[PDB]
Write a protein that binds this ligand. Structure first.
Ligand code: UZE
Lengths: 202, 244
């Protein structure tokens, strides 16, 4: 079922096996980077322990990284069974097209690209590894990435981990703990969910 | 938006970035502090690196990747990773390693750790194609996307600028890296012992010792070089007034 679906929950404790396989996985995790914290983080082991590998047999993973997560995300990427084959960077601009850790000011954000298995029938090569786009709101990922993903693998099932309510998108299932309840439509998913959560509570 | 547009017209999104106070006296202090340029022809495969002294405050490492000749002796990351970089790096020192945009983004980090550095900054060279939009890229088989940038990893060991460099893609087979990397490095004021491995005649430069196989001339003398940093000049950042 093409339209937005989502599941409010803790991705740590949700049984992602019910959701089936996905041509594309995206995650922008709350890594435990250099202290701070305007939101609750996951520790390294909980990220290593996430159950990404059940989610795909053949396809791609898009993994947002910052700070030390540039090295840690490469680990999770490899442990989860992926190989990093690309790396998109987003150049942050203003509404007039100019540019806006300790030693250097960050003008960009990184998103590792990982492959698993043997994806076939994908339009590899259509976009380039560079996104230029205005920062619409703090800590938000740019909508252009969904365009790039759709062009890459049109029509396919996709899942987002640690999405927020604005991340809901056709062909996508968004997981996030600040989402509005549980909105599901694809029957097989609705089936394995009722069979796994009869009284509906993770 | 702009990625829809590149799939339309052949212009990379970065073709559209604009503009790409006076910290000018800084550049004068770097320039006054700068050692005379020194350079040395050396086959770095076969060259006992230890013969380079003293130990360096900054190392810029631009090994010739097989991927740079994707259209025109190349080093593998096997070869790079066997360099004994840790032997010539001062206890507190910095490295800038050109990693390209393939496996290098991973293997280069293995190197940074093999030699004792932590990654500090990922600097991206973003290449516009405003003068040849109708020429796309021949991708690596593993590639998902057109590759239109290169990464220069920054590493530190021991205890003002942006992490983006925007210029136009060099002609096929030109492998020079944007000279702007030298400005970023020099503005950090990291020390005056600066080493550029696999530099060329075209990269020689005040404030630097260049070592590479294709140099046509050499003027290196370890004692002459060492002389530049004996007291009272040993600890200057490179950004201060020279000691009278
Ligand atoms: C405890 N387990 C959970 C957690 C969970 N959430 C976890 C918290 C979550 C929403 C979902 C998202 N978050 C957040 C915010 C910013 C970033 C950083 N990034 C970096 C790259 C950019 C610039 C593309 C974009 C910004 C990362 C984040 F992760 C802020 C926020 O408020 N919430 N959902 C289910 N289970």
């Amino acid at each position: 079922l093409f339209p937005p679906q989502w599941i409010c929950c803790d991705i740590r404790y949700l049984d992602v096996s019910i959701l089936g396989k996905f041509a594309v996985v995206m995650a922008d995790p709350p890594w435990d980077i250099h202290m701070e914290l305007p939101y609750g983080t996951l520790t390294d082991d909980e990220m290593r322990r996430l159950n990404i590998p059940v989610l795909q047999d053949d396809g791609f993973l898009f993994l947002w990284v910052t700070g030390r997560a540039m090295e840690l995300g490469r680990e999770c990427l490899n442990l989860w069974g992926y190989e990093r084959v690309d790396e998109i960077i987003w150049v942050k601009t203003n509404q007039l097209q100019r540019i806006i850790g300790h030693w250097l000011n960050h003008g960009k954000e990184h998103c590792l690209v990982g492959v698993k298995g043997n994806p076939q029938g994908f339009n590899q090569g259509l976009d380039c590894d560079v996104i230029v786009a205005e920062v619409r709101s703090t800590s938000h990922k740019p909508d252009e990435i969904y365009g790039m993903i759709e062009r890459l693998s049109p029509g396919t099932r996709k899942i987002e981990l640690f999405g927020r309510p604005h991340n809901v998108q056709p062909n996508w299932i968004t997981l996030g703990n600040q989402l509005d309840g549980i909105h599901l439509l694809d029957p097989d998913v609705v089936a394995r969910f009722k069979q796994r959560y009869p009284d509906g509570i993770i | 938006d702009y990625c829809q547009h590149f799939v339309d017209t052949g212009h990379r999104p970065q073709n559209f970035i604009r503009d790409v106070e006076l910290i000018r006296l800084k550049d004068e202090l770097i320039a006054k502090s700068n050692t005379p340029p020194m350079y040395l022809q050396a086959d770095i495969e076969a060259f006992d690196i230890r013969e380079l002294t003293p130990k360096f405050d900054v190392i810029l490492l631009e090994p010739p990747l097989e991927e740079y000749y994707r259209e025109t002796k190349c080093w593998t990351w096997d070869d790079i990773m066997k360099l004994e970089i840790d032997e010539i790096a001062a206890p507190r020192s910095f490295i800038f390693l050109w990693c390209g945009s393939g496996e290098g983004l991973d293997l280069g980090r293995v190197c940074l750790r093999k030699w004792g550095y932590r990654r500090c900054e990922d600097i991206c060279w973003i290449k516009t194609n405003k003068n040849n939009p109708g020429k796309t890229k021949t991708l690596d088989p593993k590639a998902v996307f057109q590759r239109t940038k290169e990464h220069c990893l920054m590493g530190i060991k021991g205890t003002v600028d942006i992490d983006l460099i925007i210029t136009e893609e060099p002609e096929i087979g030109n492998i020079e890296k944007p000279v702007e990397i030298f400005h970023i490095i020099e503005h950090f004021c990291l020390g005056r012992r600066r080493l550029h491995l696999f530099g060329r005649d075209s990269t020689i430069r005040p404030g630097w010792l260049t070592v590479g196989p294709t140099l046509t001339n050499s003027n290196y003398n370890a004692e002459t070089y060492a002389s530049y940093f004996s007291a009272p000049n040993s600890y200057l950042t490179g950004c201060t007034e020279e000691i009278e």
